[PDB]
Amino acid sequence: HWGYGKHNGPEHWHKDFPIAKGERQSPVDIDTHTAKYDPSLKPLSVSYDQATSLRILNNGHSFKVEFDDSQDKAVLKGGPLDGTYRLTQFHFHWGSLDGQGSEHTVDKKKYAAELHLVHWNTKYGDAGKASQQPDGLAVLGIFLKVGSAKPGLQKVVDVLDSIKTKGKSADFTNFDPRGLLPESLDYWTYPGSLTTPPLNECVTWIVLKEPISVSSEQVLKFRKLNFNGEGEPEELMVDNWRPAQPLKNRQIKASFK
Numbered sequence: 483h484w485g486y487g488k489h490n491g492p493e494h495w496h497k498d499f500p501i502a503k504g505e506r507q508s509p510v511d512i513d514t515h516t517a518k519y520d521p522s523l524k525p526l527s528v529s530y531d532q533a534t535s536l537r538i539l540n541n542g543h544s545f546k547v548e549f550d551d552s553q554d555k556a557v558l559k560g561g562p563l564d565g566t567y568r569l570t571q572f573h574f575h576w577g578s579l580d581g582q583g584s585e586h587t588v589d590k591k592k593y594a595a596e597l598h599l600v601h602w603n604t605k606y607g608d609a610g611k612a613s614q615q616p617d618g619l620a621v622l623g624i625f626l627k628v629g630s631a632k633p634g635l636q637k638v639v640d641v642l643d644s645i646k647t648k649g650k651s652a653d654f655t656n657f658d659p660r661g662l663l664p665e666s667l668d669y670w671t672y673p674g675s676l677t678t679p680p681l682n683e684c685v686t687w688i689v690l691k692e693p694i695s696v697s698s699e700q701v702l703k704f705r706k707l708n709f710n711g712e713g714e715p716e717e718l719m720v721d722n723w724r725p726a727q728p729l730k731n732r733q734i735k736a737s738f739k
């Protein structure tokens with residue numbers, strides 16, 4: 483199957499998923515000088531007060547916290563979005579070293595990791611149908627740099643030993659994703675894609691300018707996860723990021739400056 487290795491990583495994905503070479507692939511480098519300040523963009527409304535986390539799993543690519551998105555709870559709106567997008571899950575991408583790991587880059591700078599909070603447009607009824615639409619998903623991306631710990635991340639870090647290998651899952655209730663957000667909601671936005679197969683061009687990307695800081699111990703715990711299932715040769719889950727893709731005919735818009 484697809485993965486992040488020499489023989490099945492990003493440079494191979496186009497063979498099963500030809501949209502890999504499409505016109506709106508993600509991630510991209512955000513060239514801050516070239517991004518257009520758009521005074522008509524709205525502040526982003528992030529309304530996470532009633533979020534209900536359910537489960538955390540290791541899917542062999544990342545780990546993901548899934549939410550109960552069966553009611554209009556945790557929702558994203560405003561910004562570049564028309565309508566209401568409901569939070570369904572978050573997951574991360576990270577590196578083998580603190581100098582790489584993010585998917586998006588800023589002026590070619592790579593962060594240690596990137597958090598993706600995945601939301602689907604309610605007009606499409608469910609996440610699966612939304613992923614078939616050009617405005618189906620909105621992913622809020624947040625960079626992680628290594629420095630002081632993020633207290634709101636610790637609950638996640640501490641359960642990872644229970645989901646070490648592909649296929650493992652656990653109950654994971656009462657997790658508040660507000661504890662993963664930076665102070666500022668200033669952002670860049672552009673039309674793009676899923677960053678893993680099937681690479682659907684269904685995402686409005688909203689990438690926050692302000693990174694969150696996590697400690698070296700917290701990110702070390704991410705790197706202790708495994709790509710492999712229990713019983714198979716151990717391959718640490720690190721460098722699960724797709725590199726920047728061609729911007730092609732897109733403009734990245736800034737909510738600030």
Ligand SMILES: NS(=O)(=O)c1c(F)c(F)c(S(=O)(=O)CCO)c(F)c1F
Binds near residue numbers: 600675677678681
């Ligand atoms: N990294 S990303 O945020 O772009 C992203 C998603 F948010 C995403 F939802 C999918 S998915 O394929 O729709 C199922 C989730 O594992 C993805 F495949 C995917 F790549």
Ligand SMILES: [Zn+2]
Binds near residue numbers: 598677
């Ligand atoms: Zn992602």
